[PDB]
Design a protein around this ligand. Structure first.
Ligand SMILES: Nc1ncnc2c1ncn2[C@@H]1O[C@H](COP(=O)(O)OP(=O)(O)OC[C@H]2O[C@H](O)[C@H](O)[C@@H]2O)[C@@H](O)[C@H]1O
Ligand SMILES: COc1nc(N)nc2nc[nH]c12
Ligand SMILES: [Cl-]
Ligand SMILES: [Cl-]
Ligand SMILES: [Zn+2]
Length: 282
């Protein structure tokens, strides 16, 4: 825990120049158009523009710790707004261009953005979610569950049980939730395109799942300001702010980024909404 490997921290940022960035976001659009099964992989980089620091960025939690400084929050977890990137991912699932969403983030923003939980794997847990030890019934709360490391929160199960409710926040020693990891692995294996957004891919097995897409000829796109463990295996690397990338991508796809109405929980995905017809590519 104290000694836990926190990985490569504070690597230099890379910025694709505008012309190279415009061309690569068009190539990503082309790949999304050509792909039957698109899986997105998200980490802490997608929440930095909402005031939540990442782990391994220049001002990341672990980076700052290494230099004896503190991470800085410009929001509480409760007052944090889903980013343009969060809301882009809601719309991409709604129009049938996103098959599955695998996230290492505990910030609860995917769930609160209105993203359907049956298409989301929260590999590291969710600050807002507590789970009954006895019946496994999960509860999505409007405030952070006040503990971490899978401890008793103090509340009891209300299913018509009184079981001990525990937080879902994995400590260093904890196995990933079997249900989320199995569905994430199946989604990544079956994918013909895996897009990583604001993750350095340094944590096993989370960071390895996008590689699973590469088996059987699938494509891998990595979007990130810093290098990532698997840059080598990427068909496409985009070095820019994930919000700039996703807003340009949505524009190329003819999709609007929907308004956020405040925190809303959607359990199950609907049939896809209408989407624009596809360009002639080849
Ligand atoms: N706006 C942005 N646009 C693009 N990239 C960004 C942006 N902001 C940050 N980044 C990049 O986003 C990347 C985020 O990388 P890391 O900080 O390792 O976070 P993880 O989600 O992969 O951490 C994995 C687990 O490790 C922890 O212990 C927890 O358990 C985590 O769940 C960096 O390379 C930034 O350059
Ligand atoms: C574990 O929750 C957290 N998520 C993120 N992203 N940053 C944190 N800094 C302290 N705790 C944090
Ligand atoms: Cl500081
Ligand atoms: Cl908070
Ligand atoms: Zn229960």
């Amino acid at each position: 825990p104290f000694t836990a490997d926190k990985g490569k921290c504070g690597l230099p940022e890379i910025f694709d120049p505008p012309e190279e960035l415009e061309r690569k976001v068009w190539e990503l659009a082309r790949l999304v158009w050509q792909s039957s099964s698109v899986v997105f992989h998200t980490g802490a980089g997608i929440s930095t523009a909402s005031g939540i620091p990442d782990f391994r960025g220049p001002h990341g939690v672990w980076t700052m710790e290494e230099r004896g400084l503190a991470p800085k929050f410009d929001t509480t977890f409760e007052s944090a707004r889903p980013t343009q990137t969060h809301m882009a991912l809601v719309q991409l699932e709604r129009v049938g261009l996103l098959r599955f969403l695998v996230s290492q983030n505990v910030d609860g923003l995917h769930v609160r953005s209105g993203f359907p939980r049956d298409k989301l794997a929260e590999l590291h847990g969710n600050m807002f979610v507590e789970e009954c030890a006895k019946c496994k019934t999960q509860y999505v709360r409007d405030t952070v569950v006040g503990t971490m490391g899978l401890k008793a929160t103090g509340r009891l199960c209300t299913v018509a049980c009184r079981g001990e409710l525990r937080d879902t926040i994995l400590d260093w020693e904890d196995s990933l939730p079997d249900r989320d990891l199995a569905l994430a692995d199946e989604a990544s294996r079956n994918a013909d395109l895996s897009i990583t957004l604001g993750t350095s891919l340094q944590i096993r097995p989370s960071g390895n799942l996008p590689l699973a897409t590469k088996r059987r000829g699938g494509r891998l796109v990595i979007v990130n300001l810093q290098p990532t463990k698997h840059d080598r295996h990427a068909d496409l690397r985009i070095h820019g702010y994930v919000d700039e990338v996703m807003t340009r991508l949505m524009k190329h796809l003819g999709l609007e980024i929907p308004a956020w109405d405040g925190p809303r929980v959607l359990e199950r995905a609907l049939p896809p909404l209408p989407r624009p017809p596809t360009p002639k590519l080849e």
